[PDB]
Design a binder for these strands. Structure first.
Ligand code: MG
Lengths: 144, 133, 231, 82, 96
RNA sequence: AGUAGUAACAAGAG
RNA sequence: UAUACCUCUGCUUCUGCUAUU
RNA sequence: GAAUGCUAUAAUAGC
C-alpha cells in the first residue's frame, strides 16, 4: 500500500531507470504543480530554498552554529554508538537482528573484504568503509 | 530520615499557579559535571584504571578518602557502589510544575506539597542551607 | 626519504610500536617521518637501558631462565596500558602518580625516570623539562654531540652509559652517510585534515539522486551555494 | 530464563557464538573491574591489554608478598606462552 | 507552548481576530522526498568544510535510491482440503 | 465451531 | 520407513525512528 | 540574586 501510494503522489513526476541498481526510479521534485487537493509530492526546490533563506535571515548563523556542533560531535562519536537501536536489518542474513549484533556481523564481514576502519574506533573511518564497500566487486561474509 | 524527622502543617484549598521549571530531583553530597563526577568515582572504586590524574582528583581528595574509608569493609558489588555514588554526585535536574518550593529536599516531596487547587505546608528534616535560606 | 631508512636501522618491533604511539595521537607515519624517527630513537634508547638489567630474588642488579627486569619500559605501550602500569607502580610502592606520562621506572630505586633526546645542548634541555616535573621523575637527558646530563642519583653505570652514546652517534653517522640527516634538521609542521573522500559507486548514486533540471550533483551544489531564489 | 524456542531452530549455533564473546568479556571484566562502570578505550588488542595488566598484577603480587616464587614462576611461564 | 501561545495571543492587533488552526498533515512520509532533504543539508552546511557537506549528503542520497523489502508475503488456502501455504515475496507472480 | 476482522490462530517442531 | 502413547518449544512467525531522558 | 543539560527494558505522542 505504502509503495503504491508513495508513487501514486509522484506518478506525474520524472520516471527513469537507475543504472546502478537497475531499479524503476520516480522523481516528483520540480514537477508540475497540482491541479487538485489530492496529496502532492511535487515540491519546488526554489520555494524550499527561499523558505530556508528566510529562516536563516530570522535566525542568523544558526545553520553554521549547528553544523559546527554536529561536525565536532561526529569527530568524537565512536562506532559503539550504532549498538543502541533495537532491531536493525542485517544484510549478511537478510533478517532483522539486535543493533549490537547487526554491527558485529558487518565489522566481521568488512575485515574479510580488507576494511579495518572500524578498528580505529571513530565513527567517521567506519562510515568511510561503508561507502567504500559499495565499490568492492564482490562482498564476502561468514555464514555458519 | 528527612521524611521521618519532618513536620506537617495545614492543607489549604484555593487556586495555585504552578510554574514549569527545571529543578533538582535529589539532594547531592557534592555537585560536579558527569565527567568530573565519573573521574572521582574511579579514584574511590577502581584506582589503577583511573587514567590521567586531573585537577578534580585533588579538589575532592577529602570526599574520595571519606567515601573510600566508609565503603572499605563492604561485600556489595563495585558496580552497585558505582551507581549509588553517581546517584549522589551526578545531578538529576528535570522540568517540573512547582509553586514557591525549589530546594531538592522539597522537590523530592513535590507530589505531597501541592496540586492546582490545594497546598500542604511541609518542613523536611536534617539541615537546610544558609544560601537557600 | 626516511621511509626506506627506518626499515634498515630499526627492527619491526620499534617501527610498529612507534607507529601505534603516532596512530594514538592521530598523525600519519608517512606524512611526518621526522616525528616517527624522534619516537623510534626515544623508544630504542629506553629498551637498551633495560635490555640486560635484571633483579635476583634477594634484590640486587645484575647482567644476563629469569623473567623479572630492573626497569619498566612505559614508552611504546598504548596510553591506557601505560597509565594502568604507571598508576599500578605508584599505588603499590606508595608514592604520588606524576601528572605527565613517564618513560621508565627503576624497581630498585623506586622512582620514575623521564628520558629525552635533543638536537642542541643536553644541559639546556635538562632545565627545560625541570619546569613541568620539578622532582616527580629523575630526568636522564642525552644528545647526538656526545653529551649526557643525568640526575644527581644516576643508576646508569659507566659500561651502560657508553652503549647509548655509541648508538646515538652510529645512527647520526648513518643519517649523514645516506644524506638524510638534513631531512630531520628542517622544520616539519602539517595540520592533519579530517579528509572523508567518496568512492565511485556512492558518487554515481548521488548524481542520480538530484532534483529534475540538473545534470550531476556538482550542478545542484553550485546552484544551492550561489543563486538566490527570492520571489 | 531465556525463551528457548531458539533450541528447536538451526539458530542454535548463535548460542555458542554468544557464550564465546561472554567468556572473552567476563574474563576482561575480571582483569579490568572499571569496564562494567565506564567504557574502556583502546585500538590495541583485548589480549594485549589483559596480558600487560596480569603481567603487572603478578609482578606487584610477588614483590609485595601476596604471591609466592612457585606461583610467580607459573605466572610468568603461562604469560610467556602468550 | 504555554509561553509561545501567550505571546502570539497578546501580539494580536486590537479590533483584529486571532485564529488557531488545529492542524494535521496527510501522507507526511509518502510525500516528503529525499532529494529535498539533500538540498536542505547542502543549504544548511554551506559554510562547513567540503568533507562534512558530503558526509551529510550521503544519508538523503541512500534514501533516494532505497529499496523496500515486502515482508513475509501472502498466505493461500483451500477450505475444502484444509491446507494453508505462505507464498514468499519473490514468488508473488508465481501464481495467476 | 469460535475468536476475531482487511489476516491470522483454532499447537509447532525432530 | 522406524524409534514416537517418545522428545523439545509457548514473544525469536522479520516489532522500526524521534522525543519525553 | 541566575543558572548547571541530558540521555532505560516501562508508558505516552507523532511519523
Ligand atoms: Mg498525519
Amino acid at each position: 500500500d505504502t509503495v503504491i501510494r508513495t508513487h501514486e503522489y509522484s506518478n506525474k513526476g520524472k520516471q527513469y531507470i537507475s543504472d546502478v541498481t537497475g531499479c524503476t526510479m520516480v522523481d516528483p521534485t520540480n514537477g508540475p504543480l497540482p491541479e487538485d487537493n489530492e496529496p502532492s509530492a511535487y515540491a519546488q526546490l526554489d520555494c524550499v530554498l527561499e523558505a530556508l533563506d528566510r529562516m536563516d535571515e530570522e535566525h542568523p548563523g544558526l545553520f553554521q552554529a549547528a553544523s559546527q556542533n554536529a561536525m565536532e560531535t561526529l569527530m568524537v562519536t565512536t562506532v559503539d554508538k550504532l549498538t543502541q537501536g533495537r532491531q536493525t536489518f542485517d544484510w549478511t542474513v537478510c533478517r532483522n537482528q539486535p543493533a549490537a549484533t547487526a554491527l558485529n556481523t558487518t565489522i566481521t564481514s568488512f575485515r574479510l573484504n580488507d576494511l579495518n576502519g572500524a578498528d580505529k574506533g571513530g565513527l567517521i573511518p567506519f562510515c568511510q568503509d561503508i561507502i567504500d564497500s559499495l565499490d568492492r566487486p564482490e562482498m564476502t561474509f561468514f555464514s555458519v | 530520615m528527612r521524611l521521618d524527622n519532618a513536620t506537617w502543617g495545614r492543607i489549604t484549598f484555593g487556586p495555585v499557579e504552578r510554574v514549569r521549571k527545571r529543578v533538582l530531583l535529589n539532594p547531592l553530597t557534592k555537585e560536579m559535571p558527569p565527567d568530573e563526577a565519573s573521574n572521582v568515582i574511579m579514584e574511590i572504586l577502581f584506582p589503577k584504571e583511573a587514567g590521567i590524574p586531573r585537577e578534580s582528583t585533588w579538589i575532592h581528595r577529602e570526599l574520595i578518602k571519606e567515601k573510600r574509608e566508609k565503603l572499605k569493609g563492604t561485600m556489595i558489588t563495585p558496580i552497585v557502589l558505582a551507581y549509588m555514588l553517581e546517584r549522589e554526585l551526578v545531578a538529576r535536574r528535570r522540568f517540573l510544575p512547582v509553586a514557591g518550593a525549589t530546594s531538592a529536599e522539597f522537590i523530592e516531596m513535590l507530589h505531597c506539597l501541592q496540586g492546582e487547587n490545594w497546598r500542604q505546608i511541609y518542613h523536611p528534616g536534617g539541615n537546610k542551607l544558609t544560601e537557600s535560606r | 626519504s626516511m621511509d626506506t631508512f627506518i626499515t634498515r636501522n630499526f627492527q619491526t618491533t620499534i617501527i610498529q610500536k612507534a607507529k601505534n604511539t603516532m596512530a594514538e595521537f592521530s598523525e600519519d607515519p608517512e606524512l611526518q617521518p621526522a616525528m616517527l624517527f624522534n619516537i623510534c630513537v626515544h623508544l630504542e634508547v629506553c629498551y637498551v637501558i633495560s635490555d640486560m638489567n635484571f633483579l635476583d630474588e634477594e634484590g640486587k642488579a645484575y647482567t644476563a631462565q629469569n623473567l623479572r627486569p630492573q626497569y619498566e619500559v612505559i614508552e611504546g605501550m598504548p596510553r591506557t596500558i601505560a597509565w594502568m602500569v604507571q598508576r599500578s607502580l605508584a599505588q603499590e610502592h606508595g608514592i604520588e602518580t606524576p601528572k605527565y606520562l613517564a618513560d621508565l621506572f627503576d624497581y630498585k630505586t623506586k622512582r620514575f625516570i623521564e628520558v629525552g633526546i635533543t638536537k642542541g645542548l643536553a644541559d639546556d634541555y635538562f632545565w627545560k623539562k625541570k619546569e613541568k616535573l620539578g622532582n616527580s621523575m629523575e630526568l636522564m637527558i642525552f644528545s647526538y654531540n656526545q653529551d649526557y646530563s643525568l640526575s644527581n642519583e644516576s643508576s646508569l653505570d659507566e659500561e651502560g652509559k657508553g652503549r647509548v652514546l655509541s648508538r646515538l652517534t652510529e645512527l647520526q653517522a648513518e643519517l649523514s652517510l645516506k644524506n638524510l640527516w638534513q631531512v630531520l634538521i628542517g622544520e616539519e609542521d602539517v595540520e592533519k585534515g579530517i579528509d572523508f573522500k567518496l568512492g565511485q559507486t556512492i558518487s554515481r548514486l548521488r548524481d542520480i539522486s538530484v532534483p529534475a533540471g540538473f545534470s550531476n550533483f556538482e550542478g545542484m551544489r553550485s546552484y544551492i551555494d550561489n543563486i538566490d531564489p527570492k520571489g | 530464563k531465556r525463551n528457548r524456542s531458539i533450541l528447536n531452530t538451526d539458530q542454535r549455533n548463535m548460542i555458542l557464538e554468544e557464550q564465546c564473546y561472554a567468556k572473552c568479556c567476563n574474563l576482561f571484566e575480571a582483569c579490568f573491574n572499571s569496564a562494567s562502570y565506564r567504557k574502556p578505550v583502546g585500538q590495541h588488542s583485548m589480549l594485549e591489554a589483559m596480558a600487560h595488566r596480569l603481567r603487572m598484577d603478578a609482578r606487584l603480587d610477588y614483590e609485595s608478598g601476596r604471591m609466592s616464587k612457585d606461583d610467580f614462576e607459573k605466572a610468568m611461564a603461562h604469560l610467556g606462552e602468550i | 507552548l504555554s509561553n509561545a501561545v501567550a505571546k502570539m495571543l497578546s501580539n494580536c492587533p486590537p479590533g483584529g481576530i486571532s485564529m488557531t488552526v488545529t492542524g494535521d498533515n496527510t501522507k507526511w512520509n509518502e510525500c516528503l522526498n529525499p532529494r529535498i532533504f539533500l538540498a536542505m543539508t547542502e543549504r544548511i552546511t554551506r559554510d562547513s568544510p567540503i568533507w562534512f557537506r558530503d558526509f551529510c549528503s550521503i544519508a538523503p542520497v541512500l534514501f533516494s535510491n532505497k529499496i523496500a523489502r515486502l515482508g513475509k508475503g501472502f498466505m493461500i488456502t483451500s477450505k475444502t482440503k484444509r491446507l494453508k501455504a505462505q507464498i514468499p515475496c519473490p514468488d508473488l507472480f508465481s501464481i495467476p
